[PDB]
Design an enzyme around this catalytic site. Structure first.
Site, PDB file in Angstrom:
ATOM      1  N   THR D  55       5.878  24.175  62.991  1.00  7.94           N
ATOM      2  CA  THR D  55       4.350  23.722  63.425  1.00  7.94           C
ATOM      3  C   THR D  55       4.740  23.882  64.763  1.00  7.94           C
ATOM      4  O   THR D  55       4.298  23.381  65.484  1.00  7.94           O
ATOM      5  CB  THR D  55       4.192  22.899  61.953  1.00  7.94           C
ATOM      6  OG1 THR D  55       4.100  23.166  61.414  1.00  7.94           O
ATOM      7  CG2 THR D  55       2.518  22.285  61.726  1.00  7.94           C
ATOM      8  N   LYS D  84       4.829  -1.822  65.966  1.00 10.77           N
ATOM      9  CA  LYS D  84       4.148  -2.399  65.474  1.00 10.77           C
ATOM     10  C   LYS D  84       2.505  -2.676  66.271  1.00 10.77           C
ATOM     11  O   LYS D  84       2.571  -1.269  67.734  1.00 10.77           O
ATOM     12  CB  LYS D  84       3.815  -3.931  66.175  1.00 10.77           C
ATOM     13  CG  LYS D  84       5.681  -4.296  65.752  1.00 10.77           C
ATOM     14  CD  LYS D  84       5.892  -5.503  66.987  1.00 10.77           C
ATOM     15  CE  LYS D  84       7.459  -6.077  66.749  1.00 10.77           C
ATOM     16  NZ  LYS D  84       7.785  -6.912  68.011  1.00 10.77           N
ATOM     17  N   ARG D 105       1.169  15.560  64.003  1.00  8.83           N
ATOM     18  CA  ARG D 105       1.589  15.583  62.792  1.00  8.83           C
ATOM     19  C   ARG D 105       2.117  14.158  62.273  1.00  8.83           C
ATOM     20  O   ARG D 105       2.426  13.464  63.316  1.00  8.83           O
ATOM     21  CB  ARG D 105       3.388  16.330  62.253  1.00  8.83           C
ATOM     22  CG  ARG D 105       3.411  16.044  61.235  1.00  8.83           C
ATOM     23  CD  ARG D 105       4.911  17.506  60.498  1.00  8.83           C
ATOM     24  NE  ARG D 105       4.635  17.831  60.704  1.00  8.83           N
ATOM     25  CZ  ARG D 105       4.576  19.702  59.629  1.00  8.83           C
ATOM     26  NH1 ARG D 105       5.646  18.569  58.663  1.00  8.83           N
ATOM     27  NH2 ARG D 105       4.367  20.141  59.759  1.00  8.83           N
TER      28      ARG D 105
END
Ligand code: ZN
Ligand code: ZN
Lengths: 310, 146, 310, 310, 310, 146
Positions: D55, D84, D105
């Site tokens: 992909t 974070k 993705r």
């Protein structure tokens, strides 16, 4: 000579009802009257190739409570171990040269029985070999049920959780299937269900079992309630979470339970037994874990001592 | 029961152990006008009910429907000058926002500055709430629990 | 029964001047007349969730010098531990089933006092819980100062290094603040300074302290010089390095020091005490570390033995 | 302004048979005639937070085949600010300030739709979000069905393998259930059976499906054999390695296959389609892989071009 | 040949108010009118040895928005030859043999200036070197001040957060101290206070600064509120979590703010500017992030183009 | 008004916006007893208050003092027959368990099955609350800021 003297202990399927009894018997004697220099001068390797610290802390404590020295490791993380071309067979051949008994836990199935081919006269105690056996856990569970229930015949035992992958529920169903009149209640999602080979076995030996939908329909009847760790990662995030109700136990549920009933769990316990249960007379999974010292002791005592006098 | 206000809403026959949840969830409390709450009263059937009155406030229309999953047989009264100028029960909304948490833990909802949104379907039996983000469907039991 | 029998030891703030004395007293007796089978038949878990091998080697050596068996781990790297859903509460509940005493070091604050809620009758000895307590270090330091100085009252103690983050300097200032007439010299950069809560405490209990710029102005006066590990990474690379002079100790400096003066350091020592100091009668940080055996022994002896006769 | 212009493409479920068709039509066109400069002076983000071969290289090659520039990343370990506090929300906020389109993705379901609320009017294109959607894959699976079979109505399509956790076999059913006359044979382990919801949906539209147990059970009816990847880890080693002749494909099997039949796989494979299936004329997965380019092209052409008058 | 052509751009400190201004002017221009082919046929290295989101994707998108090609890397783990023996000197020696310009982010202070001695006549552009410089950030912070405020003279600018280790708040002061009439409010933890040198410099030019303790203490005087990222790790958990109402911004605070005030942050953020600050009209950090493109464009335009007659 | 009970407790004089907070924290509502809460009541006599009344329920000693960090000026009063049999005002207690959360992020209280405990020391210009576990002292402002 004693029936288990110098016997390797690899699988529950290998032990008899009698062997079982004798081990549960001795566990009781030793729990009552300690034998602190029984195994003075013996050295036991405690070989945990896969790290699993409660079974290990239990086993090494037991070895120390009988007077023995312990040598070994806790790999998985890694030491100079399990790699580059050294086989388990050449590894077991060397440590058996050193020690009096090998206690070992391995990532792969069949490893302790392979250990047995190379350990010479040194006994091998299986502390779990992949998804296959873990006799020593089944043994403490049997001594816990025998101590709380007074009997190992004729009981109402419910099995809750992932019964598909439960190597613990699978051996306790086969160990318990050696005594008589026991009724089994399996309470799993259809997805984490009790295998057909188990069910065959049971139907074949003539034993009553039934699948149930809620802990709830069973509670009135049950003697032992054995909970099991659901592997959250063995289902889809949305699949674990989605039930309707769930398979978690909370104190409320226990209101219909019998005075003799106990809740048993091999631990780690994470989602499945709510902490309010701990305050209940029924909760007994820490005390179970504790019986791990006496059943494990028992084992080493019978494997290493010819005629144990007690 | 308790009596008269003028120009305010009065939501009657909340279940019992539900009236507070509605005060919490729907943040009805964060107001300047007099609110009065009767918990564990009677004055209208089915034995147990909490009652909430917020004066000079009116829960216009889709705000009443948002009560349906918790108080589906609640009656919401529009009051003006001591009389009930209107009464509506809650109906099932097409979407419930802000108060639910997605049951699926690999859902993005849980880490981000987004509000929940669940589309609603099936009625007065199971109701499946589908997530805006992960698009998984769940029974309202599951969503309205842990 | 003894005042510390079966007491958990979690914080210096919990112990009294008397408790302190009794522990320093027994340390002295045991250092003089060894008791090698005092704790025969006891098993102690040594649970180091965070690995810290000098405190650990000291504690397990001490346990062996009294006759005890040790079981445990050294995690941080990792074992099957500290993760996936097992709580410290369910972990402590199981090991207390196994052992006679839990010695434990944890990464997080408050952990040994949490341990205490779940350890039943088994005593918990804190071997450090984050930035909070480490009593057992303060104890060896007090026995080292008492042994070298003959007294714990009325001394000139200088505190050098990072006094901001020094969990060791903070407890020794609060332990020492229980005895009388002690004068404190704090010698830190203003950036790694002794906290106000400490200073409040001191002023409140009526004690003389002063901030000084160089080890140098203090040297003539000092009895104890306690050095501290500066965390080089707790300042900018250019900030540690840039002082003018520095906060490192070299033998030269000690020329004005009193005959009784000692240099004490909790170790690891890296930049801050020049190796030429080692050859000096003043250097005493290895011998301090050594007193870790007797003070630690002392502890376990008093916690596990009702009426210790000596 | 074509019906997909500046649209986000997050779920197959949000696209009509009408849209699906305009995508396939365009793909076909671009496939017949390359337009190397359509997207000249556009800059497109490739954000693979979860990283992935076909992909990623498929879309980046599409962007190049059309003229656009790519800026981006791949990850699962680290690379840049985000783990974070840098929320996906904050990351999209800033990247939609830089590029003309984001293809992403990500491991967590719902991520591209959340992205949609922070990208202003920059469209986002779902390259896969968790176990949820992958609409782009589906568009090339339908272009390879339409291209080998001539239609997308009245087909006999079999889904084999993990029909339970398979993200692609779910969407592909969703899509094919928007065209008339399709019959669906489902050959999975029952352990890995098609979810109920998909079958409930299918029951609604009167579409015919059926469970099956041998590929050989239907290998004479089928026009499309969609082959999906089982993942070892989910099943027990002795569980997977069982099942008579498994759910793998070997060329032998293809012996009674319709001439027009094509074997498709979303890729990667490991044992499931043997290498011998490869030189058969039924083998069509590397082709399908190739069709990823034009289908991908089609979408970037339509989302970023007011009307394509190709 | 414009005054920045083929110049290296390493420190803000090496640029005049005159240069700073030509950069802002150009940015503004390019922002009004895109020149997609200015840098056609140029190849530019992105060397991020320390890797980083907005500055990397910002510069690579700038290179594309102007026509150039990029070759490069990101790192902190590995990727290619460089850790032992491949000295930065040797790496720059060889890369300046390949590209027309090097933009590099590196962990060690001094790295881009060292690079400058090995790149022949290929300019290098500092994308951040250690705790030292980041001149590119500063240029977009000044373009966002000039663009929201209309000037860079006679401003009330507050710096909040870590004013001690903050690389950006240092350079930004350096730069603003080259234009007349600026007053500087410094609201940091005193633990994290502005270095002396910066204040000494500021005292020299008669520029007014002052320490402050509440953002609320000046949130009525200020035109720019520069918000910087505190990093957890440096301070103690109980240290950071203290301080009355902290140094964070919540929308409530913005209630007495001048209309023209803008809140800027160099990005990333984690708790310091609450999400509610975001939909206020004062919120301007994602905008500032966006301005990174044109400012970045401006610099590559000027360094690589003899005269920009835009 | 919200007043006439034959027996129970009446927390009068609650500062506005706190009564809901009080019912939440102290879990006054999980009971199937009559409770009448009045929020943002006229209260000119003392600004604008809230008022909570629970019938057949008597909060003893420890409980009233637990209200001290929240509504320090409130008035508990018991009723045993239809009149005010007693008066009580919150005194700051030595300890506050269960309700506050530790500011320390590395405190073990944060993931374990344990209740928080803080010891109260009114020092100088606020109260300092030291945690049971981590032993860190914080001003009630920080603790309440959460
Ligand atoms: Zn969701
Ligand atoms: Zn705490």
């Amino acid at each position: 000579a004693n029936p288990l003297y110098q016997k390797h202990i690899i699988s529950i399927n290998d032990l008899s009802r009698d062997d079982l009894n004798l081990v549960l018997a001795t566990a009781a004697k030793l729990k009552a009257n300690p034998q602190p220099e029984l195994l003075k001068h013996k050295v036991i390797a405690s070989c945990f190739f896969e790290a699993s610290t409660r079974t290990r802390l239990s086993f090494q404590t037991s070895m120390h409570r009988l007077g023995a020295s312990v040598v070994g490791f806790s790999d998985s993380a890694n030491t100079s171990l399990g790699k580059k071309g050294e086989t388990l067979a050449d590894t077991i051949s060397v440590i058996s040269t050193y020690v009096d008994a090998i206690v070992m836990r391995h990532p792969q199935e069949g490893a302790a029985r392979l250990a047995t081919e190379f350990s010479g006269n040194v006994p091998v105690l299986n502390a779990g070999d992949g998804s296959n056996q873990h006799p020593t856990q089944t043994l403490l569970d049997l001594f816990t049920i025998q101590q709380t229930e007074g009997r190992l015949d004729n009981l109402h035992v419910a099995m809750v959780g992932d019964l598909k992958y439960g190597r613990t529920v699978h051996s306790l169903t086969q160990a318990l299937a050696k005594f008589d009149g026991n009724r089994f209640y399996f309470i799993a999602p259809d997805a984490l269900a009790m295998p057909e080979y188990i069910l065959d076995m049971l139907d074949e030996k003539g034993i009553a079992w039934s699948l149930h939908s809620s802990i709830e329909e069973v509670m009135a009847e049950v003697d032992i309630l054995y909970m099991t760790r659901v592997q959250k990662e063995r289902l889809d995030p949305s699949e674990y979470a989605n039930v309707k109700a769930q398979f978690v136990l909370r104190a409320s549920d226990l209101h219909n339970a019998k005075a003799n009933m106990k809740v048993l769990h091999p631990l780690p316990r994470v989602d499945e037994i709510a902490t309010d249960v701990d305050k209940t007379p029924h909760a007994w999974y820490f005390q179970q874990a504790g019986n791990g010292i006496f059943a494990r002791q028992a084992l080493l005592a019978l494997v290493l001592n010819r005629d144990l006098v007690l | 029961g308790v009596e008269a206000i003028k120009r305010g809403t009065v939501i009657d026959h909340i279940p019992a152990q539900i009236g507070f949840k509605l005060l919490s969830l729907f943040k009805l409390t964060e107001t300047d006008q007099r609110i009065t709450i009767g918990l564990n009263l009677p004055s209208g059937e089915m034995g147990r009910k909490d009652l909430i009155k917020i004066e000079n406030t009116f829960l216009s229309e889709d705000q009443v429907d948002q009560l349906a999953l918790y108080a589906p047989q609640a009656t919401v009264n529009r009051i003006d000058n001591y009389e009930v100028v209107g009464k509506s029960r809650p109906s099932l909304p097409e979407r419930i926002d802000n108060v639910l948490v997605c049951p699926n833990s690999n859902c993005i909802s849980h880490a981000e500055p987004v509000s929940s949104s669940f589309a609603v379907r099936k009625r007065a039996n199971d109701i499946a709430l589908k997530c805006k983000y992960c698009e998984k469907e769940f029974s309202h039991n599951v969503v309205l629990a842990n």
